[PDB]
Amino acid sequence: RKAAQFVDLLGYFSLKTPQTEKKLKEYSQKAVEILRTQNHILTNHPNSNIYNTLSGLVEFDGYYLESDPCLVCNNPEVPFCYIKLSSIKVDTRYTTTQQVVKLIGSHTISKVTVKIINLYYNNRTVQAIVEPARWHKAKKVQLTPGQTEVKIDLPLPIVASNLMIEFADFLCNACGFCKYARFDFMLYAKPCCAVDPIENEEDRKKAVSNINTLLDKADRVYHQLMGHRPQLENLLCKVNEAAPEKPTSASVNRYILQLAQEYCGDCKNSFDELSKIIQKVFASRKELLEYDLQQREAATKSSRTSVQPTFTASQYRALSVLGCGHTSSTKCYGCASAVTEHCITLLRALATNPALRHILVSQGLIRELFDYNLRRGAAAMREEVRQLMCLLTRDNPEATQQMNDLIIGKVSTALKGHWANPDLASSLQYEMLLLTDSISKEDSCWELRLRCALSLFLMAVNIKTPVVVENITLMCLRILQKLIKPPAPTSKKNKDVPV
Amino acid sequence: RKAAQFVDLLGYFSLKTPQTEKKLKEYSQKAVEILRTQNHILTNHPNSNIYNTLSGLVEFDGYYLESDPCLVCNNPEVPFCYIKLSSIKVDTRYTTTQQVVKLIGSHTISKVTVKIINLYYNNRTVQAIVEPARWHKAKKVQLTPGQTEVKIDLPLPIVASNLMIEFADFLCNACGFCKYARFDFMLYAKPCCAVDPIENEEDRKKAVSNINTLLDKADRVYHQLMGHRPQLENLLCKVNEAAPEKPTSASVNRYILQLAQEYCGDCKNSFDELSKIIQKVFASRKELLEYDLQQREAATKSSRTSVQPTFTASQYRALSVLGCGHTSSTKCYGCASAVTEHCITLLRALATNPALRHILVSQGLIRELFDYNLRRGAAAMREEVRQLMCLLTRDNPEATQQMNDLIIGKVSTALKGHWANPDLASSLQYEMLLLTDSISKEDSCWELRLRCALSLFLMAVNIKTPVVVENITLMCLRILQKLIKPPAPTSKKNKDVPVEALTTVKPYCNEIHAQAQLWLKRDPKASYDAWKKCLPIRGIPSKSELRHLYLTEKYVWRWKQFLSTSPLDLKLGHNNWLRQVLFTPATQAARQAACTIVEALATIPSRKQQVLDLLTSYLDELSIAGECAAEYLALYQKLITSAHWKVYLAARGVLPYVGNLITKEIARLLALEEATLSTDLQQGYALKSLTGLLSSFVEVESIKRHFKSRLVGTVLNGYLCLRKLVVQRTKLIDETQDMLLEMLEDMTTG
Amino acid sequence: SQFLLTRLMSETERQSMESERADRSLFVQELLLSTLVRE
Amino acid sequence: SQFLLTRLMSETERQSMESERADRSLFVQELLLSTLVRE
Ligand SMILES: [Zn+2]
Ligand SMILES: [Zn+2]
């Protein structure tokens, strides 16, 4: 989902630059191939059935049944917030002119507002507050006398776990009570997942042991999370039968309530814990790798015969830990869904060029959109896919005929066995919606669309079943009514005269 | 629903009475015609869509969207309850020896218990309690002196609205307080819907006005109730789309919550209010009609010329108001459903007669049941219909073939377009359940059912979509597993022997006589009986005799081959459906079922050798399908628990195979570690499994003594490469390192 | 419990049925092996 | 709102379009009446 701006610019540039037809063909082929591969990935995915059936019953944010956690989906953009210091305060010590505070964890502070100084910080976790060389200065500030509120700004946000405040120029050593003034502290911060730094060998051993412990805990939680899947299958199968049960929030089917509890209650909690542990493991690994790299470079620099290997600017970023945590998992459902959304948006932008439209319809895009993306995704994406399918047939009689053939064939096949299964007549809403959308836009191929609508109407006007009347005949009647009574004219000379 | 006992008796009498075949045909035609008419009514009902959609989402008792309220459905059997007189008390008055009480409404009282007497009652509503001619005596009870509890038992329940208690033989006229004793009252009563009786003309006029007011109120409530239908259908349309929405009882789809609130919250209340008003109207109408008939009869009896027309006993019941409130409405969903249930029960009882079964299947009952009643109704009735459909085909090859054709056609048609719509694959559960039920009941037509199951299995075994694997391949695998591993014997002579020792024929060592390709095409030369005729029966010695058996077998086999159908050779192909099924990540149950299947396929050593050969060929799939192989390994390690199989596998050269696989995926681990920093929670599973397998191969002494000189290099190279790992390290890699070091130290002691 | 319609085997036939079960199991084993044969 | 791809008629053509809409309406009326003629 990070690539919205890229595909936006790509579609715009392809639309604005006039280019030869071979390049247009290559671009269309690339886009359609990506769309096809993502569709194939989505349909055969092991969790495809569970998510597809759960989408229409419960409301959930993410996909929590994934074997390999995806870093892209696990680290959304959390914003900075105003936090009072006492809310996260755990241990404190006051001395004659200094104050030392320990937080609950590691925080990314941006600016500090003090209401009625020298600021030090460090990111080493200690258990005793009593426990000048292990502090880092942040900002030195001078105050005009009589100032009441001072907003110290840190140009670079600091990742700190312990803070210290010193009064260089003008408190109780037991309780910290001050008679001159009262100070209150606010932070422009957010929680951060980072570990203590490594400076020697014993710290390296400590880091290795902590990483092993975290991996063990992650494995246990992962097995707990993967143990929920058979229960979800059993409940899904029980829901699919839809047998009536005899007994207003508790009047819903008990199986649907159990499904909601099993997914949005426990799978979500296990997924959140697993994500936290994975982030901690990743941070620790990054710290360990950075220390190892520094040690190796220091060891190599001591030798004299060997020359230091020069790196270009891109090579440094590739080698270093800068480009390490921006890759999505391979078999990720959410990322594949996002890529399909980007493909639809790019293709909608591309189809506004008639030559590209002809090339796209020659690739075979209409059938791929019909079979796969009509019923998959959120409501907005489905409407967008209908819009793209309508646009691809704007002035192409062959494309309109092909789409009409697809719609008519599906409706006829469903209606053949409607007597024995109502879902056949209840699973045509997207085909009829497509027909409505295509007809509602005026073009030069209105006759073929009207023929399709009228043929479907006369084929299903004599069926007394209510589901056919509500799902087939009503839509065709609305299409015919719209065509019979056109909107009132807006031209000035025809503002009064009737149709 | 009142006609359960009638259809029970009807079925029993029809079954026990011996009767000619013409009467059997008439009875079957009657039952099937009623069933067909009810099915037609159900599928075309105006509210059928709404109820069918709501049944799978909410839990509702009745059908509250009916234009004509049904007397049978809104008049259930309300039982008597024990009620305090104070709880229904509204107005009271007391005098020296009488007490007068008014209730909130009319009650049907049956027994009155007093815990520490003359009882009067009436059913005339008054506003003032103060307001001997307007009371009816009910029961006179005398008390033994010093008694504390009395039970006035009314032989006939009384419908009363006001009560009176008078102490005929042995109270404050302002407050009612009595110092001699204090009395408490119990009633064995229940609410009733009744009106004041009509005795003169002005009472009749008041009754007419009251009925008009009630009709007006009922019309208003009915219009309010009917106004909910467009909103219900709008919410149904919005639910059917099933578009995902983003935000544990509150996490359900908001449209489903709104549907539950709209149906079970407001429609139910309006239906109950309408039912109450309809009952009041019916009571008032009955009272007015009875009064009018009585007045007319009194007027007619005054004349002398006209003689009173005698009525027989049945005619009196027909004419009087007695036969007035027991008839169901025509366009009623609930009553039609009840009639369908009764038809299914009666047909199930009837089908136990073979001649009736044949006539029923000749009427065309199987297709009607398949099309209509498989998926409609409660779960109990659905299982009942599946049982009846299985029973109708108990020993009839034609009926079994017809049912199989329906099932196969439906599954194939759904599977054709499954790629473009998963709902098709999700709506075969009842067809597959029917196939399962039909197979699980042993009969003489088992071969046809097995053919249907196997055809469906082989058609849909190679589809990778999880919905097909969960909904088609899994059911067929379970059927196959039930057929392969039959239940343990219970007879005394076979209480110990296994199922392998019970067969009456002995399969040939190196040949397979069953031929599935011709069997699936209904070739009579490849049938089950033909196959059984081809095998030698299990028989119930000197060196000369052993030699004679050897040459007789050899040259008889040569003679048969010279004559030649040709039996297949036991050479298993290395690419089949088995590899696809054994490692499918869609569902674990499919893998477990396949593992049991192939475990049972390996009993005689001739088949065991080939099964182990194929499973060994499947070894390279551990890396691709890391945890999904957990079942397959658990089978493989179970099949080589004996030493000689390990030695045979070593003699075929699997140790270099396993070593090469370990080395290759260790190289992959090193390459991944050098490049990326991502975390894999299944890393080292394939390594751990393969190294454990190598350890199991090595522990036995002969292979350890022989194969050490070729494996030390791979072992030490792997150990050093794993030791080089510093960041992409998990617990499993640590265990692999330990076990590899143990193998390295054990190898180098000679 | 009062419904009449809700209330609707020797040892020799028992061993016969067990032997038939064994024969059917063997036939299904052979028929499933026949589909794995190399082409 | 910063997305470029989101931001992707005279009077004579308007009268022409209105007349064409009326003509199509008349054609559809004739077509619908043609299916109600007695056979
Ligand atoms: Zn992802
Ligand atoms: Zn009814």
DSSP for A52-87, please give it.
HHHHTTB--SS----SS--HHHH---PPPEEEEHHH
How does strand A118-122 pair with strand A149-166? antiparallel
Residue bearing tokens 């009736």: B356
Of the candidates B364, B365, B366, B386, the residue with the CA atom closest to the CA atom of residue B375? B386
In chain A, residues with a C-beta closer than 8 Å to the C-beta of B254 are: 59
Amino acid letter, B24: L
Report DSSP state, residue D37.
Answer: S
Task: Name the residue among D14, D25, D32 with its Cβ closest to that of A486.
Answer: D25
Query: What are A122's strand-pairing partners?
Result: A162
CB contact under 8 A, C37 and B502: no
Task: Name the residue among A12, A458, A491 with its Cβ closest to that of D14.
Answer: A491
CA distance A278 to A300: 33
Q: Which of A344, A352, A440, A483 to mutate to test the interface with D (most CBs of D within 10 A)?
A: A483
DSSP for chain C, please give it.
---SGGG---SHHHHHHHHHHHHHHHHHHHHHHHTSB--
Chains in touch with B (≥3 Cβ pairs < 8 A):
A, C
CB contact under 8 A, C36 and B9: no
Q: How far is CA A499 from CA A490, B114, D23, in A?
A: 12, 85, 9
Q: How far is CA A300 from CA A198, A322, B726, in A?
A: 19, 22, 19
Residue bearing tokens 């990314």: A108
- Is A16 in CB contact (< 8 Å) with chain D? no
DSSP for B289-304, please give it.
HHHHHHHHHHHHHH-S
Torsions phi, psi of A17, nearest 5? -80, 120
DSSP for A12-41, please give it.
HHHHHS---HHHHHHHHHHHHHHHHHHHHH
Torsions phi, psi of A159, nearest 5? -95, 105
Task: Tell me which H or E stretch contains A138.
Answer: strand A136-140
Q: Residues followed by a break in chain D, C–N over 2.5 Å? A: 8
Work out the minimum CA distance from A427 to partner chain D, whole angstroms: 28
CA distance B634 to B599: 11
Tokens of A65: 């049944």
Q: Is the dihedral of CA A171, A174, A176, A180 positive or negative?
A: negative
Of the candidates A82, A66, A86, the residue with the CA atom closest to the CA atom of residue A74? A66
CB contact under 8 A, A218 and B681: yes
B266 CA → ligand 2 middle, Å = 21
Other CB atoms within 10 A of residue A441 CB: 13
Closest-approaching ligand to the CA atom of A331: 1
Query: What are A91's strand-pairing partners?
Result: A102
In chain B, residues with a C-beta closer than 8 Å to the C-beta of C23 are: 503-505, 532
B428: left (phi over 0), alpha (psi -120 to 50) or beta: alpha
CA distance B632 to B510: 26
Tokens of D38: 């007695």
Tokens of B579: 């590899």
Tokens of A49: 């059935």
CA distance B113 to B101: 16
A291 CA → ligand 2 middle, Å = 81
CA distance B526 to B524: 5
Task: Name the residue among B237, B423, B466 with its Cβ closest to that of A427.
Answer: B423
DSSP for B543-562, please give it.
HHHHHHHHHHHHHHHHHHHH
Three-state secondary structure call for residue B83 = strand
Of the candidates B472, B376, B371, B381, the residue with the CA atom closest to the CA atom of residue B428? B472
Tokens of B721: 């490469």
Question: Could you write out the three-class secondary structure of B563-610?
Answer: HCCCCEECCECCCCHHHHHHCCCCCHHHHHHHHHHHHHCCCCHHHHHH
Of the candidates B411, B449, B416, the residue with the CA atom closest to the CA atom of residue B430? B411
Q: Residues followed by a break in chain A, C–N over 2.5 Å? A: 116, 131, 170, 247
CB contact under 8 A, B569 and C21: no
CB contact under 8 A, B504 and C19: yes
Closest-approaching ligand to the CA atom of A68: 1
Task: Name the residue among A48, A59, A68 with its Cβ closest to that of B246.
Answer: A59
Within the 460-479 window of chain A, which residues sit less than 8 Å (CB to CB) from chain B?
464-467, 470
A79: left (phi over 0), alpha (psi -120 to 50) or beta: beta
Task: Name the residue among D4, D11, D32 with its Cβ closest to that of A12.
Answer: D4
Of the candidates B466, B395, B481, the residue with the CA atom closest to the CA atom of residue B436? B481
State the first-to-last Cα distance of chain A, in angstroms, to the nearest integer.
49
Q: Is the dihedral of CA A167, A169, A173, A179 positive or negative?
A: negative
A228 CA → ligand 1 middle, Å = 21
CA distance A125 to A210: 13
**CB under 8 Å to A485, separation ≥6 — which residues?**
A499, D25
Task: Name the residue among C14, C25, C32 with its Cβ closest to that of B491.
Answer: C14
The helix-helix angle for A379-391 and A333-350 (nearest 10°) equals 30
In chain B, residues with a C-beta closer than 8 Å to the C-beta of A245 are: 59
B76 CA → ligand 2 middle, Å = 11
**CB under 8 Å to A232, separation ≥6 — which residues?**
A50, A65, A259, A262, A263, A267
A222 CA → ligand 1 middle, Å = 17
**CB under 8 Å to B648, separation ≥6 — which residues?**
B609, B612
**CB under 8 Å to A58, separation ≥6 — which residues?**
A256, A259, A260, A263, A264, B251, B252, B253
CB contact under 8 A, B57 and A253: yes
**CB under 8 Å to B153, separation ≥6 — which residues?**
B111, B139
CA distance B562 to B540: 30
Cβ atoms of residues B216 and B106 within 8 Å: no
Distance of CA A485 to the CA centre of its chain: 44
Of the candidates A92, A87, A130, the residue with the CA atom closest to the CA atom of residue A107? A87
**CB under 8 Å to A302, separation ≥6 — which residues?**
none
CA distance B686 to B689: 5
Cβ atoms of residues A251 and B58 within 8 Å: yes
Task: Name the residue among B240, B677, B681 with its Cβ closest to that of A426.
Answer: B240
Question: Environment class of residue B694 by beta-carbon count within 10 Å: exposed (0-12), middle (13-18) or buried (19+)?
Answer: buried
Task: Name the residue among A483, A487, A491 with its Cβ closest to that of D28.
Answer: A483
Of the candidates B140, B142, B100, B141, the residue with the CA atom closest to the CA atom of residue B122? B100
Report DSSP state, residue B624.
Answer: T
A110 CA → ligand 1 middle, Å = 29
> What's this structure's resolution in Å?
3.1
CA distance A69 to B680: 8
CA distance B719 to B724: 9
Work out the minimum CA distance from C7 to partner chain B, whole angstroms: 10
- Ion ligand 2 neighbours (CB, 5 A) are B 70, 72-73, 328, 332, 334-335
A271 CA → ligand 1 middle, Å = 13
Three-state secondary structure call for residue A115 = strand
Chains in touch with C (≥3 Cβ pairs < 8 A):
B
- Locate all alpha helices (DSSP H) within B78-200, ordered by sequence: 85-88
Torsions phi, psi of A329, nearest 5? -65, 155
In chain D, residues with a C-beta closer than 8 Å to the C-beta of A483 are: 24-25, 28
CA distance A325 to A72: 8
CA distance B35 to B41: 10
- Is B519 in CB contact (< 8 Å) with chain C? yes
- Is A285 in CB contact (< 8 Å) with chain B? yes
Q: How far is CA A295 from CA A133, A313, A371, B723, in A?
A: 22, 22, 57, 19
The helix-helix angle for B333-350 and B379-391 (nearest 10°) equals 30
In chain B, residues with a C-beta closer than 8 Å to the C-beta of A252 are: 57-59, 252, 256-257, 260
In chain B, residues with a C-beta closer than 8 Å to the C-beta of C39 are: 573
CA distance A34 to A343: 7
Q: Which of A214, A253, A288 to mutate to test the interface with B (most CBs of B within 10 A)?
A: A253
Work out the minimum CA distance from A33 to partner chain D, whole angstroms: 22
Report DSSP state, residue B527.
Answer: S
Three-state secondary structure call for residue B399 = helix
CA distance A290 to A197: 10
Cβ atoms of residues B333 and B43 within 8 Å: no
